[PDB]
Amino acid sequence: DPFSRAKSLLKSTILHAERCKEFVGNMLEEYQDPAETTVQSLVPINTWGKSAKRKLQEEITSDPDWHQCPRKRAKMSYLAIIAGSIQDRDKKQTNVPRAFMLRGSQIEYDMKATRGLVVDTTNRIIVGGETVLRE
């Protein structure tokens, strides 16, 4: 199930800094990761990979301690999921989208966490309708 599968991954990364840092580094540099094939099943085939990796690298440069902050983890999780997604080899690479629909579904996934799978109201962080953090 794409929904439940996305929910599991994002909980593991948003709630755990060490796992999020590991996950992000593996997606950015393409090394083994337990969510490798999961990531590929969730994102439609796209041309966004290099853009996502640039974004990831800008963030690490500007704030090394990004993994300390839950809002940043959610954002970097979004970019990392795209960074490890299946790329269309025949098309020009293009800019990452701000949101996309999880593969084979109308489940929206938003980078700024306004809508869909991951929702951040500045009080809670809600993953798949389940509140996982509350300030």
Author numbering: 547 to 681
Question: Can you list sentences taken from the study reporting this PDB entry?
Answer:
The three largest gene segments of the Thogotoviruses, THOV, DHOV and JOSV are homologous to those of IAV and code for the heterotrimeric polymerase. In this paper we present the atomic structures of the putative PB2 cap binding and 627 domains of THOV and the putative PA N-terminal endonuclease domains of THOV and DHOV. Despite very low sequence homologies, all domains have similar folds to those of the corresponding IAV polymerase domains. However, the critical active site residues in the putative cap binding and endonuclease domains are not conserved in THOV and DHOV and, contrary to the case of IAV polymerase, neither domain shows the expected in vitro biochemical activity.
To explore further the structural and functional similarity between THOV and influenza polymerase domains, we determined the structure of the so-called 627-domain of THOV by crystallising a construct comprising residues 543–701 of THOV PB2. The structure was solved de novo using anomalous scattering from a mercury derivative and refined to 2.4 Å resolution. Again, despite little significant sequence identity (∼8%) between THOV and IAV in this region of PB2 (although the motif QSLVP at the end of helix α3/4 is conserved), the domains clearly have the same fold. Interestingly the loop which in IAV carries the host-specific residue Lys/Glu627 is extended by two residues in THOV. A large region of the IAV 627-domain surface is positively charged, consistent with its ability to bind RNA. The corresponding electrostatic surface of THOV 627-domain also has positive patches but less uniformly. The structure-based multiple sequence alignment of this region of PB2 strongly suggests that DHOV, Jos and Quaranfil have a similar three dimensional structure to THOV, although Quaranfil is more diverged.
